[PDB]
Amino acid sequence: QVEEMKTQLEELEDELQAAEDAKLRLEVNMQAMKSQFERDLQARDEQNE
């Protein structure tokens, strides 16, 4: 029982660390790509200008 419970310990801790870190950094990338999209917006804006 203690073997299996610490097995779930390791498995769930590793999976939660990976998933949450990827999620937070993927929202960081979300903001970054939104920023690049808005730079392309100002590029089209200056072409129109």
Partner 1 sequence: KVIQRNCAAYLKLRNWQWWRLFTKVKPLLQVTRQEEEMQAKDEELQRT
Partner 2 sequence: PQRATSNVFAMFDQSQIQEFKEAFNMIDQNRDGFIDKEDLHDMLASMGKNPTDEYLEGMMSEAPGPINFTMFLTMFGEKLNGTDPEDVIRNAFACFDEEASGFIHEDHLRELLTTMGDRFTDEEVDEMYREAPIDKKGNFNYVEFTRILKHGAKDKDD
Which positions lie near partner 1, rule CB under 8 A?
Answer: 21, 24-25
The one among 22, 23, 34, 45 contacting partner 2 by CB under 8 A: 22
Smallest gap from Cβ 9 to partner 2, in A, equals: 5
Nearer to partner 1, 30 or 41 (CB): 30
- Smallest distance, partner 2 to C-beta of residue 48, A: 23
Among residues 10, 32, 13, which one has the least CA distance to residue 21? 13
Q: Is 24 helix (H, G, I), strand (E, B) or coil?
A: helix
Joined together, the tokens standing for residue 42 give 């100002």
The Cα 20–Cα 32 span in angstroms is 18
